[PDB]
Amino acid sequence: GHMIKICIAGKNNIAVNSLQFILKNYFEADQIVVIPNKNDKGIDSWQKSLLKFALDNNIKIVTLDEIYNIEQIIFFSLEFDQIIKIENFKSDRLFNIHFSALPKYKGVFTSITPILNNELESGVTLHRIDNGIDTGNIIDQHCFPIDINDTARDLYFNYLKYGESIFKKNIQTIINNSYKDLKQTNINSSYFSRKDINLVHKINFKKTSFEIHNQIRAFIFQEYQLPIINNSKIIKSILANEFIGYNVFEEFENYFIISGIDGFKIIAQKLN
Template sequence: MTVRPLNSVFIGGRQIGANCLRVLVDMDAPPQLVIPDPDDVGVDSWFESLVKVAKELSLPTLRGARVKDESAIKKIRALKPDIIFCIGSMQLIPKEVLAIPPLGVVNIHPALLPKYRGRYSTAHAIFNGEKETGATLHFMDERIDSGPIIMQEAFPIGNEDTARVVYDKFTEVGTALFKRFVESLKRGEEIASTPQDESKATYYPKGLPSGGKMDPSWDEVTKKRFVLAMTFPPFPMPDID
C-alpha cells in the first residue's frame, strides 16, 4: 500500500479539534503548524485547550493569531500545505487562505448538511423536534457551511438528549469521520465530494432557538424541547419562567 506524506496546517478549537489533532499525530501525519483560536490561552474549559494539546504533542503553534491576519496568511502560504484542516474553530477562513492548499480546506459541521448551516446547530435540531442529526465533513468555500460534502454520518437524537449530549455524540462521530478521511488521504485516494442541494438548505444565524427565551404560550412538548435544546453544561440555563 502506498502511503502518501501529508503536509497540512491545522486550524482548530473545541474538543473535536483536540481529538482530531491527536488523530493526525497518532497516524504519523502531524501538521506543519497548529493555529488555535485567538482566545485560547492554554487552559482547559468545557473542552481541552488546543494550545495545551499542541504543546503536549510538541507541535509548532501560532498563538493569539487570527487566520485573516496578513502575518498568518504569509506563514501559511510559506508552508505550502497540501490541505488545511479547520476543525472546531470559531474563525472564518478568508478567501486568501482558501486558495492556498491544492486539496482544499476541510471542515466538520455538527449537522447533516445542507440542513442546519450556521451556529448552534444541535440546539436548533432539538428544538425543531428532529429525530436525528449528524456530522458532515465538507470542503469550505467563501459562504457558511455550503461547500461540497465529502463524508457524512447520521446518529439519533434521543427523547431526553440535551444539546450537550448531542454535541458530545457529534464530537465522537466527527472524530471517527476525520480518521477515515485521513486514512484515505494517506492511501493517496482521490477526494470525492458532492455539491450540496441548495433547495434543501436551511441556515441558522448566530442566535439561539427563540432568541434563548421561552414563550409561555407554547405547549408542553415545545417547552420540553426548548429546555433540552438550551441545556449545555457548564453554561447556565436562561430564564425560562
C-alpha cells in the same frame, strides 16, 4: 516539497483528538502546525485545549497568514472560529467538519437549532471549504439520533464523538487526495446566525408537549446557561407518552409538571 504537511485549526476534544491521531499514525510533530481559537486560554477543563496540547507536544502555533503560501498543505477546521477566503491560499486542500447533517443547519449553535426545530436526528458532515458558510461540497456525513430527552449538551458531545470518528474515517483519502465529494443541494438548506438565537429563551407554552419539551432542552448546556421557568433553573426535561390533560402547569419544590395543547406529560427537573 514543503516541510509542513497539515494544519489543524480549531478547538475542543475534536481538534485535540484528531491531532493526536495524526501525530500517531500519519505525520511527525515537525510536519504539523495548529491554529487554536482566539478564546483558547490553554486550559484543560470540560474540554481539552488545542493550544495546550500543541505546547505540551512541541507543535508550532501559527496564524492563517503563515500558512497561505504553503503549497499543498492540508487545512482542517475542527470548530475553528474564522471564516476563510479560499483565494488567500495556494492550497485547495481545505476542509471543515461541521456539526449538522448538511445541508440543514448551516451556521451556529447547532447543538440548539435542530432541537428547537423539532428534529429527531442530526449529523456531522465532512466537506470542502468554499467561500460560503458551511456551503462546500460534502465528502462524508454520519447521521445519528437526537434521543427524545437529550439536551443541547448531550447532542454537542455526540457531535464531538462522531466528528472525531468521521475525521479518522476519511483522513487517509484526504492525505492521498483520492476523496470524492458531491455539491450540496439547494433544497433543505437552512442556516442560523448568532442574531437568530436568543440564549435567554422565553418559552411559548401555547404549543404541544413535544414543542415545550424541545424549547426547554435545546437550552440545557450548563457550562453556558440553563433555561429558567418561574425563576428556577432547569437541568433536565423528560417527555412521556402519558396523557395528563391539556395545558397543565404545576410548580413543585423539585420539578414542574407541564403539558401543552396535546396534553402529554413533561417533567422539568430543577437544578436545586
